Symmetry: none
């Protein structure tokens, strides 16, 4: 089922979009998204695919909860940056894990 770790903060990924609007939007608003991701701890069943899959799901789900205090563009930006950060987190965990 569940149980997720929260990774340490990281620099927000710079991401380039074909849409001039999205490209500029991300540059001006990347501060609005998290700089940490939730993930399922590295074990014997982990691999990049399933680690990033879970991290992306959990992190986005948790973020929806947390910000109970759209837009479609924001959902799109959020998923791109979370996925990139989740890959970075996989590199962290898999290397620490050896």
């Amino acid at each position: 089922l569940g149980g997720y770790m929260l990774g340490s903060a990281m620099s927000r990924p710079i991401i380039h979009f074909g849409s001039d609007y999205e490209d500029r939007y991300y540059r001006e608003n990347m501060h609005r998204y998290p700089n940490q991701v939730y993930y399922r701890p590295m074990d014997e069943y982990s691999n990049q695919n399933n680690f990033v899959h879970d991290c992306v799901n959990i992190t986005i789900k948790q973020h929806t909860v947390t910000t109970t205090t759209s837009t479609e563009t924001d959902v799109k930006m959020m998923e791109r940056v979370v996925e990139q950060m989740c890959i970075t987190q996989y590199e962290r965990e898999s290397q620490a894990y050896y």
Copy 2:
């Protein structure tokens, strides 16, 4: 010219926050290109212009009915393959 066509690369498995899109990608990823067009590396080359160039040329080249979902998937596949191609070409330029 003056763009290059990169060699085929393994299709990335790309993750979406939407359960529908995430699964749609898994089932249909074979429908999108596994090569991108790009401007070869030089002393003026940075991730910024390299990625933007690659995305602009690749998406048009492709632009010559498909669903809004496939258009979305294709644009994202290209945006993420152009990053990979930059990394590939970066190392090559050393």
